[PDB]
A paper describes a structure:
As a zinc ion–dependent enzyme, CDA participates in the pyrimidine salvage pathway by converting cytidine and deoxycytidine into uridine and deoxyuridine. Bacteria extensively exhibit two forms of CDA: a long form and a short one. The former harbors two tandem CDA domains typically structured in a dimer assembly (homodimeric CDA or D-CDA), while the latter possesses a single catalytic domain arranged in a tetramer assembly (termed homotetrameric CDA or T-CDA).
Due to the similar molecular structure shared by gemcitabine and dFdU, distinguishing between these two molecules based solely on the electron density map pattern posed a challenge. However, considering the catalytic activity of EfCDA, it was anticipated that gemcitabine would be rapidly converted to dFdU. As a result, the molecule identified in the co-crystallized crystals was determined to be dFdU. Additionally, the O4 of the dFdU molecule, working in unison with C55, C88, and C91, demonstrated chelation with Zn2+. Hydrogen bond formation was observed between E57 and O4 and N3 of dFdU. Notably, the two fluorine atoms of dFdU establish hydrogen bonds with the hydroxyl group of S49 and the amide nitrogen of G51 via a water molecule. Furthermore, the dFdU molecules were discovered to interact with F26, V28, T53, F127, and L132 through hydrophobic interactions.
Author numbering:
A (entry chain A), B (entry chain A): 0 to 132
C (entry chain B), D (entry chain B): 2 to 132
The structure:
């Protein structure tokens, strides 16, 4: 079922918290990006001594997937060690809008099983696109 | 009046379109960031041969203002040569959320006088903050 | 410095796989670990140009996400008359994860190449030591 | 290379002005134009670390937004035992707007300094030539 699959994706994103490279913030974030073909891509945040070159977990998952030729995504899970479900930052929301349909579901996870259901469009309303370039 | 001030800010953002450094996209964006003290900061997008080091007009305005000690913002105008009012990208929305109140008004401008009224919260719902760091 | 044709092939083959709808300027990377495992990178652009990710960083983000921490070589290729140059942001990510002396091979069109290292590309590198 | 105390003062004074609630690691910059006009930079962090902007880039974004295109010197200061090092991203922005030979002065605590140039900090610099 869709709910049982979502729990395996949640597990993938939560396990990513243990793989994060965060020696400066000590704030791990995990992601599970799911393709239309069923393949999952796990993302971690990856920091840099120069903070601005840090890459978020959500973007790591997209860059992994897109590098393998993936262009059709059906779900994204993001997890954090947070009392409420973790929130993707605006930069990640913009990468999500580049590759995903507006109505693609996004599940946000925090500690102690808390979750929030949303979509790409709800996280980034009136999204900037390539339309006018 | 608030509406007459908003038109001077709109003019500032539109004039910024002529100052943009966009030799690669040729897509200028202008910004007018207004402080509680009445001071305005004009932003332009500034590209780099390595595209990822490009800085948006909205962020240029914030970096100018914050570098002068500004921490209290009351309005942001963003303008583009676009048929509908220009949309700030997610990265800019995240910088807006760092420094602005959720309900701070944002005016988006396109060509031929088209405008859209919104706020920091509406552009970036459920915003990620420093709360859990 | 050792240079395997597989590594060159990995970086050049990536040129056809890049996500570059805005620049049409593909960049390819092959990042090699101590075990010999290879990670291919492509540049991945965004309608907001400043969210673009370079091929070199894509390769590092892939490898680091799989737990790799020991790198022995990086090949970078472009469709360029001289060997392609990694940008400064990529050089800083390379310095995060690689030894100063780790070899780097830069490739352009028609077989032009240039051999260098992490330290030569980023002298007097900024590190975390004073944070 | 000419070095004015005003420029050093501008970069060091910026250390007290930085927006660094996450690292508490301030960086200051003084960017000088041909006309002698100076632009002060600070690093400006973000709760999402990857949206942080460096002091060097803040100075360039300020100057370029005011129409400046001719730069003659960059001073960068940190509270560091050795002169602070610009990160690779900053070096790439410097290469966008500065001559290869434009002088750069790096400053640390207790008056330690190091003189360099844009080209020495970013050898074999990537440019727009093949786009
Ligand atoms: O959307 C987001 C927002 C933040 N993070 C990570 O939080 C830490 C502190 O910023 C950094 O390592 C990070 F990369 F920004 C994500 O992974 N995704
Ligand atoms: O929010 C935004 C989104 C895009 N832009 C600019 O559009 C051009 C094409 O991406 C680039 O120069 C730019 F910087 F990204 C902004 O200025 N602000
Ligand atoms: O070091 C580098 C420098 C540039 N590129 C790519 O060139 C295009 C134009 O900037 C963008 O798509 C890109 F990502 F920045 C790399 O992949 N690596
Ligand atoms: O070149 C550089 C390298 C780092 N910094 C600043 O150091 C802190 C920790 O990375 C961040 O606040 C910062 F912005 F990246 C600069 O200002 N310039
Ligand atoms: Zn993010
Ligand atoms: Zn933006
Ligand atoms: Zn790069
Ligand atoms: Zn920097």
């Amino acid at each position: 079922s869709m709910a049982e699959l979502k729990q395996e994706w949640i597990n993938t994103a939560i396990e990513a918290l243990d793989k994060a490279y965060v020696p400066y913030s000590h704030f791990p974030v995990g992601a599970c990006l799911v393709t239309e073909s069923g393949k999952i891509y796990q993302g971690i945040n990856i920091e840099n001594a120069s903070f601005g070159l840090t890459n978020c977990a959500e973007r790591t998952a997209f860059f992994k997937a897109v590098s393998e030729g993936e262009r059709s995504f059906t779900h994204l899970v993001v997890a954090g060690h947070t009392p409420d479900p973790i929130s993707p930052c605006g930069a990640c929301r913009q990468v999500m809008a580049e590759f995903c349909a507006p109505d693609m579901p996004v599940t946000l996870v925090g500690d102690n099983g808390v979750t929030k259901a949303t979509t790409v469009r709800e996280l980034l309303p009136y999204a900037f696109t390539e339309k006018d370039l």
